[PDB]
Design a binder for this molecule. Structure first.
Ligand SMILES: CCCCCCCCCCCCCCCCCC(=O)OC[C@H](COP(=O)([O-])OCC(O)COP(=O)([O-])OC[C@@H](COC(=O)CCCCCCCCCCCCCCCCC)OC(=O)CCCCCCCCCCCCCCCCC)OC(=O)CCCCCCCCCCCCCCCCC
Ligand SMILES: CCCCCCCCCCCCCCCCCC(=O)OC[C@H](COP(=O)([O-])OCC(O)COP(=O)([O-])OC[C@@H](COC(=O)CCCCCCCCCCCCCCCCC)OC(=O)CCCCCCCCCCCCCCCCC)OC(=O)CCCCCCCCCCCCCCCCC
Ligand SMILES: CCCCCCCCCCCCCCCCCC(=O)OC[C@H](COP(=O)([O-])OCC(O)COP(=O)([O-])OC[C@@H](COC(=O)CCCCCCCCCCCCCCCCC)OC(=O)CCCCCCCCCCCCCCCCC)OC(=O)CCCCCCCCCCCCCCCCC
Ligand SMILES: CCCCCCCCCCCCCCCCCC(=O)OC[C@H](COP(=O)(O)OCCN)OC(=O)CCCCCCCCCCCCCCCCC
Ligand SMILES: CCCCCCCCCCCCCCCCCC(=O)OC[C@H](COP(=O)(O)OCCN)OC(=O)CCCCCCCCCCCCCCCCC
Ligand SMILES: CCCCCCCCCCCCCCCCCC(=O)OC[C@H](COP(=O)(O)OCCN)OC(=O)CCCCCCCCCCCCCCCCC
Ligand SMILES: CCCCCCCCCCCCO[C@@H]1O[C@H](CO)[C@@H](O[C@H]2O[C@H](CO)[C@@H](O)[C@H](O)[C@H]2O)[C@H](O)[C@H]1O
Ligand SMILES: CCCCCCCCCCCCO[C@@H]1O[C@H](CO)[C@@H](O[C@H]2O[C@H](CO)[C@@H](O)[C@H](O)[C@H]2O)[C@H](O)[C@H]1O
Ligand SMILES: CCCCCCCCCCCCO[C@@H]1O[C@H](CO)[C@@H](O[C@H]2O[C@H](CO)[C@@H](O)[C@H](O)[C@H]2O)[C@H](O)[C@H]1O
Ligand SMILES: CCCCCCCCCCCCO[C@@H]1O[C@H](CO)[C@@H](O[C@H]2O[C@H](CO)[C@@H](O)[C@H](O)[C@H]2O)[C@H](O)[C@H]1O
Ligand SMILES: N=C(N)NC(=N)NCCc1ccc(I)c(Cl)c1
Lengths: 140, 171, 48, 174, 95, 83, 347, 98, 112, 104
């Protein structure tokens, strides 16, 4: 996850859209693969093909969210000419929420996902801007 | 890193004592007594220096003493010695205790013809002292300077200023 | 062997210390007939 | 060459592990472990560990593995299933052998390989010691030191074995 | 140890087997005795944070003795060169 | 003294194998502390020289260290020859 | 079980733990874990039923796997440093293996699945040992090797445990499963602060043990293992319902009760290290625990659930169970916050 | 590292994967657990013997003794499981699901 | 020291007073434990077993006193270590040049 | 090399005798003429497990001939007797708990 996250955060915001969308699709896809692995391990599919279908459904869903967040957030920053703006990420996060409202087909989930994935995405941008540490190195 | 310094092939040449292990075993007790001084000097050098390159000259004297020792046996007691080590060599374990008749003949020959007295049980395992002109090595390990120790906290232990100072607690 | 190998110092130690280090089997018998290497390495263990 | 005996034994060691780790009938899985134990003793023997090698035979194979087979015959399998008859076992068995063969082939071709971590392939003899002329076995000296140096080890080891007897009698009384 | 009972009572329960440069039966030394001794004496009492930097030289040498990774690599280099020359006829080994 | 004697006679009649076991195990624990020869086992074990006796550098004030193995200073194994 | 044998087996559980705590040699640490696991199994099995046998087997498989991984870490450490001293490890792969092994021994997420199941399948007294005394030895090793643990790994385990413990407890009616998921959540706080200040790890461990022992002892006093069975306490021992209420609120971290102190101190240490998101996320997520603690207070103390007619027969008999140290532990479980500065004794 | 270490670690990994990937028989999983012990014994013995760590020569014996005692406990649990259900199948040990 | 509850150097510090407020609270906790012991066993809460209630107070006070001694010693050690380190490294703890508010510029933010 | 050859010869000959014992001329021309609890006592399990634990103790006594060469004889003799006594206590425990009985 380190290197993929390093490619994404090296590209300047609002530019090189295709590279940003690839980085998030790989991030989203990997998350989908991890979820599929645990899902298949702990809830045994009735057949080999059901398990493969579940892996594709989850992985594609997660890659779909990752792709839309990267493209929409990069398109917004490019169009608005605001690279260091958390609003662009807020827009992309909600787009991902809509996709999760489409793959699961549930207007309620989409609305809830957009607000919460939208807020979460904006906080990530703020953290990058201001140097917020999630796993802070010990210092005192 | 540096180049591992080695002596020249010619700096390592010396006459070798080319006799078999049973021959050395047969002569071992008299050899220990006769050549002790150069032998102990060499072993002191090896344990102090911890470097085979630093005791080569002492090792050449070990060989010379061994050769002269075996040249004395050859001159005087060649026949009793040959019978004795040939008896040792037959045994698969080279046992002393199976050759006491032949050992007595060899022992009686060196005592008469050279004055050699076989050392007693326990003697050759003694720790002995060696007088050497060689200087004592100062840093045989080639140690670097050790890191300075942490500054040492000292003084009189006083109560903590205003107590624990934890949030609102006054003690 | 290493005359025309760039950046190869001949006889360079791998240790920072200049202390004498006992060589391992590969250093001594590195370039010798397998018959001697086998005897040196496994002769004692294999002797009957 | 006999210069690669330790490496060859370790190749068989792994093949025995892929044997029982693929988990065929517990009877055949037990056989794979017995073969691995013997091969493992040979590896330890060639490093100068005669006593440790013979303990594997005496205790691990003649002791623990006998009780495993005894228990298997009683409370698990009385008649083996045909080996590699199940597809899952065969797939796992073949996969481990294919991985092993690639490691062996590549380390032998380049005399080194990087399977996750980097290993040397010159032969294990290269790391051996070059100056032994003592009148005793050093492994024997170390193990004999259990009774002079290891008083604490003897106490806790002996205590655990006694408790093992008491415990297993409690478990099995039912 | 979490509770250093051994040092409080002056009794040695397992320290005797923690390092290979400790006392051994019949004074049999480990192969890397001098390297472990040097590293231990360099790092003694200064704490592991300081030692990780100030004793890196001794520790790298001790690690080299332990696993001989740099030595085997050098031997692999010389052997590989020798095969080439044998494969090209520019080297005939002595007797 | 008697009730114990009446106890021993019963186990000797009923379980001679166990009485012998316990008797031998007791002697194995007790006799080493009583034996006058036990002290020699320590000395003989220490007198066996497994490794080389490294000589000491002579600093001029070691009158108890022999210069030669056949000198009269240092430990003697005369006690062992008789034993 | 013969009472003398029970005592000797209990003393061997303790000895295995003590060997881990006083050992300076990795081999002796490993022996302590092996001895401890040998003696614990019989007390899990002592009521002879298929559920107890399944619990002991699942426990054996988990702990034996973790101990093999620990031995592997020790041996890798030996090859890369040539020594056995219990301290920081000298190889990152050894550090990961030892950390994962200790996580399995502690039942931290995602190695947590065995804790709710084993705790459910054994008697209350055995579950008390499993969730309190058995945490001492693995925590005492983490206390010593933490300078070399991977920060991302240990904090990921902590976060997952707090989440899984909080969520897992929401769906439980069995008291033994509630305590198990509560234990998983609390292990998360202990390890989250370990990289920053191990003293707060000890403080949280000690207070956790006191509060957990109090709950199990009160459950044993009335022989209650389900939520509904506990809801009859008001009609038999009203005093017990109040003590449970106080202890549950304390376990929920509510001030001014004792259980607030570990969360308070851990948040302080993390913020001093500029860790702000993680403590806040931790504190909010711990509200899941507070929720299913509160649910129990509702059915035990704050309302009166329906009774049965045979309960009247119980009115004529007094509590005869030992309830050893219960009066002392309940006071410590609830009334210690004014003495918070006393934590420095743990330095 | 040395070439032998490649295969000894591979053997441990193979048995660990075997242990974590159950089939039906509990005995088959107990064999994998012993496999990990055997590979640990070999890896420890090789390291200790090659380095001439004299006092550590007893450590593999202690490992063997304690792990065999562990295996005896494991076997005893297996027979008790087999007495209950008539087989040592792990699928029967699912009561604590609820 | 090493695995020592109160090392010998702790004896240079003033002991906690026997009227320490924290020690009074510890005694109060012991008294509360005595009452809960009566309650859970359905005895008269205030009157039953005064001998038992007395030992509850005494035990808490006795242990509390030594815990308070160790607590104060640890905090004295923390301060001792801190000040000695500040002295050992004067370069890291310089005396800040202090300016009066007449010289220091602070922006003014009107509230209108 | 000798031990390997001896072992290879011993089992190769054993293999040859076994296969020839199975495939010899027969002079006939006509057609030739599962994993449960075996009904076996728990007592037999306890024997095997008891053997294992005693065998592990024996592994610890095996170094005794070498240990007797130590100068620390006081410690060595105390620890040897301790281990054997603990082995005897193990037997006494099985015996008095009816672990060595074959009735019932
Ligand atoms: C070096 C590293 C180590 C090297 C190892 C090399 C190999 C040597 C042997 C090692 C031991 C292997 C042990 C294998 C084993 O015993 O598993 C039995 C295991 C279950 O045993 P079983 O009871 O006989 O049932 C068989 C099936 O599960 C059918 O039964 P079912 O009821 O489960 O049917 C439904 C099926 C449904 O299957 C699916 O839906 C899978 C769909 C996934 C699509 C992607 O479920 C499964 O197959 C279970 C697995 C589900 C996938 C888990 C996530 C992946 O069978 C398998 O899963 C087969 C896998 C064999 C592949 C081995 C490869 C090992 C590689 C390890 C990773 C190393 C990389 C680094
Ligand atoms: C026998 C009497 C012995 C004697 O003569 O001296 C004792 C003392 C006179 O000695 P003194 O040295 O002259 O000090 C008197 C100064 O005025 C006071 O001396 P000071 O200036 O050093 O201040 C006292 C100091 C001493 O250090 C202490 O920390 C003592 C802690 C006192 C415990 C009070 C707990 C009740 C809190 C309010 C509820 O407290 C602090 O260090 C920081 C303040 C601690 C506040 C505690 C509340 C925050 C804790 C968070 C959880 C509780 C929140 C409220 C609920 O007389 C007392 O007032 C008794 C001390 C209080 C505790 C013992 C009595 C138990 C009271 C139970 C309260 C029941 C709560 C009902 C709800
Ligand atoms: C500063 C931080 C915050 C404060 C820290 C507080 C730390 C805790 C302090 C220690 C608390 C110990 C319990 C207080 C003693 C009160 C119990 C009592 O009166 O028993 C009298 C006891 C028996 O009274 P009982 O009729 O059975 O009922 C008393 C409780 O129900 C007995 O029920 P139990 O099951 O709870 O008995 C517990 C006790 C066993 O009961 C006892 O015998 C109390 C022994 C207390 C020893 C004093 C410790 C302080 C000295 C440090 C050294 O367990 C022990 O062995 C002591 C540990 O009489 C005695 O034999 C006195 C002890 C003779 C020596
Ligand atoms: C250490 C580093 C490890 C990092 C990974 C941590 C993740 C560990 C997850 C452990 C908990 C797994 C249990 C669980 O979360 O539920 C299993 C769940 C099954 O349900 P599912 O198929 O996903 O959805 C159908 C619902 N009707 O399926 C899942 O949700 C599995 C995916 C969980 C991970 C996200
Ligand atoms: C500080 C915390 C102190 C914790 C004290 C807890 C004492 C136990 C609580 C009293 C409950 C009554 C009792 O006697 O304990 C029950 C248990 C024995 O089980 P039981 O079924 O009651 O009878 C045994 C017959 N087989 O007895 C036990 O097995 C005791 C189990 C608790 C031991 C672990 C206590 C936590 C660890 C404390 C160490 C702190 C560091
Ligand atoms: C310096 C003065 C300090 C004053 C402040 C004290 C309050 C702070 C400390 C509270 C900590 C808990 C104290 C221990 C509880 C003791 C009371 C108790 O548990 O018994 C209740 C009892 C019921 O009455 P009874 O007829 O005796 O029936 C007994 C039933 N088994 O009740 C009785 O009838 C006995 C008479 C005494 C009752 C005391 C009740 C205190 C309730 C505190 C509630 C918790 C704080 C909020
Ligand atoms: C409902 C809310 C739920 C919880 C939400 C929590 C949000 C937390 C904020 C996310 C963490 C901050 O995110 C992280 O910040 C650091 C800032 O040092 C960034 O740091 C980055 O800076 C440089 C340049 O800026 C990059 O080249 C480099 O890739 C990276 O180090 C990380 O790329 C980013 O991943
Ligand atoms: C539940 C049961 C608990 C029982 C606890 C029993 C504790 C027993 C402690 C045994 C260790 C006693 O203390 C230790 O013993 C051994 C032998 O006596 C001594 O060791 C001695 O023999 C060998 C010989 O080389 C070396 O360890 C050392 O050279 C020598 O001093 C240690 O120097 C001493 O520190
Ligand atoms: C002299 C010391 C030598 C060291 C000995 C080494 C330690 C050996 C420890 C063995 C201890 C055995 O302890 C043994 O316990 C049982 C208790 O049921 C006693 O035997 C008792 O129970 C049996 C039934 O089994 C009764 O028939 C018998 O009447 C009664 O005596 C034995 O009389 C006692 O010998
Ligand atoms: C269940 C627990 C079982 C524990 C069993 C332990 C039993 C121990 C019994 C024997 C212990 C003492 O055994 C023996 O005693 C004599 C004391 O006269 C010791 O002393 C003897 O040998 C030493 C050598 O060290 C001499 O210096 C000494 O002059 C001599 O008296 C022996 O060194 C010791 O070998
Ligand atoms: N590891 C940490 N982050 N914290 C830590 N233990 N710091 C050491 C500072 C300290 C604090 C309180 C006391 I009382 C003492 Cl004596 C020392």
């Amino acid at each position: 996850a380190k290197t993929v996250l390093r490619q994404y955060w090296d590209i300047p915001e609002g530019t090189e859209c295709h590279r940003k969308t690839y980085a998030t699709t790989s991030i989203g896809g990997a998350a989908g693969l991890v979820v599929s692995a645990y899902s298949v391990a702990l809830k045994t599919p009735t057949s080999f093909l059901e398990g493969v279908a579940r892996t594709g459904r989850y992985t594609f869903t997660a890659a779909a969210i990752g792709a839309i967040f990267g493209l929409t957030s990069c398109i917004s920053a490019q169009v608005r000419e605001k690279p260091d703006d958390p609003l662009n990420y807020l827009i992309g996060g909600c787009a991902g929420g809509l996709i999760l409202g489409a793959r699961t087909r549930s207007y309620g989930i989409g609305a809830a996902a957009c607000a919460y994935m939208g807020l979460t995405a904006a906080l990530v941008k703020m953290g990058q801007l201001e140097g917020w540490q999630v796993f802070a190195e010990p210092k005192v | 890193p540096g180049i591992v310094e080695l002596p020249s092939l010619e700096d390592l040449k010396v006459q070798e004592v080319k006799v078999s292990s049973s021959v050395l075993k047969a002569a071992a007790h008299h050899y220990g007594a006769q050549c002790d001084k150069p032998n102990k000097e060499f072993m002191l050098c090896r344990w102090e220096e911890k470097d085979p390159r630093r005791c080569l000259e002492e090792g050449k004297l070990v060989n010379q003493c061994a050769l002269e020792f075996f040249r004395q046996i050859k001159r005087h007691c060649a026949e009793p010695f040959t019978e004795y080590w040939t008896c040792i060599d037959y045994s698969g374990l080279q046992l002393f205790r199976r050759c006491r008749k032949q050992q007595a003949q060899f022992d009686e020959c060196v005592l008469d013809k050279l004055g050699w007295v076989r050392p007693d049980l326990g003697d050759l395992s003694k720790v002995t002292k060696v007088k050497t002109d060689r200087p004592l090595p100062e840093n045989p390990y080639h140690s670097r300077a050790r890191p300075e120790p942490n500054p040492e906290v000292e003084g009189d232990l006083k109560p903590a200023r205003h107590g624990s100072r934890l949030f609102f607690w006054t003690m | 062997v290493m005359k025309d190998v760039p950046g190869w110092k001949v006889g360079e130690s791998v240790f920072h210390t200049t202390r004498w280090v006992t060589p391992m089997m590969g250093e001594l018998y590195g370039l010798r007939a397998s018959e001697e290497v086998l005897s040196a390495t496994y002769g004692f263990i294999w002797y009957t | 060459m006999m210069l690669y005996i330790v490496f060859i034994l370790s190749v068989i060691f792994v093949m025995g592990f892929v044997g029982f780790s693929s988990k065929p009938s517990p009877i055949y899985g037990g056989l794979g472990l017995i073969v691995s134990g013997g091969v493992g003793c040979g590896i330890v023997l060639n490093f100068g560990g005669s006593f440790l090698g013979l303990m594997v035979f005496l205790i691990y194979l003649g002791g623990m593995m006998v009780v495993f087979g005894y228990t298997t015959a009683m409370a698990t399998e009385q008649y083996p299933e045909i080996w590699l008859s199940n597809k899952a076992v065969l797939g796992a068995f073949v996969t481990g052998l294919l991985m092993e063969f690639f490691m062996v082939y590549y380390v032998l071709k380049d005399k080194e390989v990087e399977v996750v971590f980097e290993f040397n392939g010159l032969g294990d003899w290269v790391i051996y010691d070059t100056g032994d002329s003592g009148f005793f076995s050093e492994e024997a000296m170390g193990i004999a030191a259990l009774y002079s140096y290891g008083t604490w080890l003897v106490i806790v080891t002996g205590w655990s074995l006694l408790i093992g007897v008491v415990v297993i009698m409690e478990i099995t009384r039912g | 140890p979490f509770f250093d009972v051994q040092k409080r009572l002056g009794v040695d329960l397992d320290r005797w087997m923690t390092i290979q440069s400790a006392e051994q039966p019949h004074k049999i030394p480990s192969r890397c005795h001098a390297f472990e001794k040097e590293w231990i004496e360099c790092a003694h009492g200064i704490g592991s944070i300081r030692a990780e930097k100030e004793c890196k030289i001794e520790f790298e040498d001790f690690r080299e003795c332990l696993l001989r990774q740099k030595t085997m690599k050098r031997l692999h280099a010389i052997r590989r060169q020798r095969e080439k020359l044998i494969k090209e006829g520019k080297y005939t080994p002595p007797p | 003294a008697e009730r114990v004697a009446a106890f021993l006679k019963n186990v000797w009649a009923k379980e001679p194998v166990l009485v012998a076991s316990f008797a031998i195990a007791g002697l194995a624990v007790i006799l080493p502390t009583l034996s006058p020869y036990t002290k020699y086992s320590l000395m003989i074990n220490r007198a066996t020289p497994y490794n080389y006796p490294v000589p000491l550098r002579d600093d001029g004030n070691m009158p108890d260290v022999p210069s030669h193995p056949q000198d009269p200073q240092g430990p003697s194994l005369e006690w062992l020859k008789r034993l | 079980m013969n009472p003398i044998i029970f005592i000797i087996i209990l003393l061997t559980i303790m000895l295995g733990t003590i060997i881990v705590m006083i050992s300076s040699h990795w081999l002796l640490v490993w022996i302590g874990f092996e001895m401890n696991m040998l003696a614990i199994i019989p007390i899990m099995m002592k009521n002879h039923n298929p559920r107890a046998t399944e619990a002991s087997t699942k426990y054996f498989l988990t702990q034996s796997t973790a101990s093999m991984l620990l031995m592997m870490a020790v041996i890798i450490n030996l090859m890369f440093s040539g020594q056995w001293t219990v301290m920081k490890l000298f190889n990152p792969m050894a550090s990961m293996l030892m950390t994962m092994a200790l996580a399995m021994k502690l039942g931290m997420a995602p190695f947590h699945f065995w804790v709710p199941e084993v705790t459910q399948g054994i008697p209350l007294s055995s579950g008390l040992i499993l969730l309190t005394w058995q945490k001492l030895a693995p925590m005492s090793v983490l206390y010593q090797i933490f300078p070399s643990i991977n920060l991302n790994l240990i904090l990921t385990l902590s976060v997952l445990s707090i989440l899984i413990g909080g969520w897992g407890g929401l769906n439980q009616t069995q008291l033994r499963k509630i305590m198990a998921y509560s234990s998983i959540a609390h292990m998360g706080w202990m390890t989250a602060v370990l990289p920053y200040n191990p003293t707060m790890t000890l403080l949280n461990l000690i207070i956790y043990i006191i509060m957990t022992s109090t709950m199990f002892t009160m459950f044993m006093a009335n022989s209650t293992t389900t939520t509904l069975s506990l809801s009859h306490t008001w009609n038999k021992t009203p005093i017990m319902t109040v003590l449970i209420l106080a202890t549950l609120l304390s376990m929920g971290g509510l001030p001014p009760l004792s259980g607030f102190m570990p969360k308070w101190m851990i948040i302080q240490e993390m913020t001093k290290n500029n860790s702000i998101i993680l403590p806040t996320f931790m504190a909010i997520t711990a509200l899941l625990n507070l929720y299913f603690y509160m649910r129990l207070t509702y059915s035990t103390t704050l309302t009166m659930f329906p009774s049965t007619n045979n309960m009247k027969m119980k009115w004529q008999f007094p509590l005869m169970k030992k309830m050893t140290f219960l009066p002392t532990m309940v006071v410590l479980s609830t009334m210690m916050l004014p003495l918070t500065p006393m934590l420095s004794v743990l330095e | 590292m040395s070439m032998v270490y490649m295969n000894i670690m591979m053997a441990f990994t193979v048995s660990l994967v075997g242990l974590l990937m159950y089939r039906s028989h509990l005995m088959s999983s107990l064999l994998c657990l012993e496999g990990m012990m055997l590979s640990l014994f070999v890896m420890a013995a090789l390291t200790i013997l090659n380095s001439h760590f004299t006092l550590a020569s007893m450590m593999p014996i202690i490992l063997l003794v304690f792990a065999a005692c562990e295996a005896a406990l494991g076997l005893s649990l297996l027979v008790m499981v087999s007495n209950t259900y008539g087989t040592d199948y792990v699928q029967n040990l699912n009561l604590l699901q609820c | 020291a090493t695995f020592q509850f109160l090392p010998d150097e702790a004896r240079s510090l003033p002991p906690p007073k026997l009227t320490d407020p924290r020690l009074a609270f510890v005694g109060f906790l012991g008294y509360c434990s005595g009452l809960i012991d009566n309650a859970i066993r359905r005895r008269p809460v205030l009157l039953a077993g005064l001998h038992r209630q007395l030992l509850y107070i005494t035990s808490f006070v006795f242990v509390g006193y030594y815990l308070l001694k160790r607590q104060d010693y640890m905090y004295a050690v923390r301060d001792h270590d801190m000040f000695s380190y500040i002295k050992s490294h004067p370069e890291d703890f310089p005396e800040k040049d202090k300016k009066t508010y007449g010289e220091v510029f602070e922006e003014f933010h009107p509230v209108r | 090399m000798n031990l390997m050859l001896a072992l290879l010869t011993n089992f190769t000959l054993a293999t040859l005798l076994v296969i020839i014992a199975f495939w010899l001329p027969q002079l006939n021309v006509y057609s030739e003429k599962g994993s449960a609890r075996l009904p076996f006592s728990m007592k037999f399990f306890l024997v095997a497990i008891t053997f294992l634990l005693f065998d592990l103790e024996i592994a610890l006594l095996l170094p005794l001939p070498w240990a007797s060469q130590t100068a620390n004889l006081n410690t060595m003799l105390t620890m040897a007797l301790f281990l054997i006594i603990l082995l005897a206590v193990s037997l006494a425990y099985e015996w008095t708990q009816k672990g060595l009985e074959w009735t019932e």
